[PDB]
């Protein structure tokens, strides 16, 4: 997208979102990042939304194919050939490529230029998320290292968020939500997931009195997601 103006890429990313053209949206936002300037809050959100939609579709497809593959590998199942595994592998490779692309943007050079807490925490949460999606499909000799990379990114983001943001800040809340999902689903640490979700919820509740009506709505929406997980987990 090197020949398109930064502002035009951003405008077209917004149009692609309205048109539900998320691969286009992600390509426009990748082009915008590659202009080399830091991203505003809105631009960071567009980048994140674009890739969450792309990888979300790939993850859902991978789960469908992985379930079919697992069923075909059961006792009393008829041999259907290599096609299910081959196609699951194709989708998996594509998904890994998207995660590597996002991680590459964060490493070159979004994170190193991010000095304010809101940008740095948001980017480190993204880094944790995309390593988490790599971990969901990992099975080889690097699976432990991929898990540790997700954990390390989330932990750095948590440490900053606790020092620099109020307990109701929506980035702080979403980071804690996603880190608790990492603990529950990836790290085999359901008790850590439950403790994190409960403490995050309770500390946010006690800070709601400081907020405007609109900030209250923002924070309580994410708090309800923490509560939904706690209801499923306990």
């Amino acid at each position: 997208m090197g020949s398109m103006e930064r502002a035009s890429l951003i405008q077209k990313a917004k149009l692609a979102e309205q048109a539900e053209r998320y691969e286009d949206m992600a390509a426009f936002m990748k082009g915008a990042v590659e202009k080399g300037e830091e991203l505003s809050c809105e631009e960071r959100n567009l980048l994140s939304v674009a890739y969450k939609n792309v990888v979300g579709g790939q993850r859902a497809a991978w789960r469908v194919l992985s379930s079919i593959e697992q069923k075909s590998n059961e006792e009393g199942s008829e041999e259907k050939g290599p096609e299910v595994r081959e196609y699951r592998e194709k989708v998996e490779t594509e998904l890994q490529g998207v995660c590597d692309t996002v991680l590459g943007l964060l490493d070159s050079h979004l994170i190193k230029e991010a000095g304010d807490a809101e940008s740095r925490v948001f980017y480190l949460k993204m880094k944790g998320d995309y390593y988490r999606y790599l971990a969901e499909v990992a099975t080889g000799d690097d699976k432990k290292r991929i898990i540790d990379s997700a954990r390390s990114a989330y932990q750095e983001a948590m440490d900053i968020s606790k020092k620099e943001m109020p307990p109701t800040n929506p980035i702080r809340l979403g980071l804690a939500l996603n880190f608790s999902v990492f603990h529950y689903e990836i790290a085999n640490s359901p008790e850590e997931a439950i403790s994190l979700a409960k403490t995050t919820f309770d500390e946010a509740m006690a800070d709601l009195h400081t907020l405007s009506e609109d900030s209250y709505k923002d924070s309580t929406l994410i708090m309800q997601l923490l509560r939904d997980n706690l209801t499923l987990w306990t």
Binding site: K14, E17, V181
Partner: peptide, 9 residues
Amino acid sequence: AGSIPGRRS
């Protein structure tokens, strides 16, 4: 277990 959907600006 649900993460942030994060799919709408």
